[PDB]
Write a protein that binds this ligand. Sequence first.
Ligand code: L46
Length: 127
Amino acid sequence: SMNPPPPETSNPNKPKRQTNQLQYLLRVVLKTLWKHQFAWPFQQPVDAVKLNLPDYYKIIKTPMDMGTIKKRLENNYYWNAQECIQDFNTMFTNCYIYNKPGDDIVLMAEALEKLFLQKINELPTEE
Ligand SMILES: CCc1c(C(=O)NC)[nH]c(C)c1C(C)=O
C-alpha cells in the first residue's frame, strides 16, 4: 500500500547520448502528449497512497510516467530512442494491465497512445 521509490532519472555512470531521434522524442513526442487534455494522470508517478490503490504496486512492477520520461529526456538519461520508446510503451501497458477495459484512465491512455504511435511512425532516421 505504500509508494515505492520513483523510477531513476539520474545515473552518472550510465553512458549517455544526445541523438536526433532522442531530440525528436522530447521536442515532438513528449511535447505532444504532455500538453494533451488527458495528460494529467500520466504527468507524475502513480501516488498509490492518495489515490487509495494499495494493490497498484503489488501488480505493477515496472512503473513509468511522463514526468519521469520528461526528466530522462531533459537531463539526458538515455543512450538511444528505443529505451525512451520502451518507457512510453511500459507506461501505457501498466495502465491496461492494472485497470478495467473502458475505465476513463484507459480511454485517456488510448488517446495518448494513438498520438504516440502517429509521431513514432514519423521518427527520423538516425543522423
Ligand atoms: C486512476 C488512477 C491513475 C492516475 C491518476 O489519477 N493520476 C493523478 N494515473 C494513472 C496512470 C492511474 C492508474 C491507476 O492507472
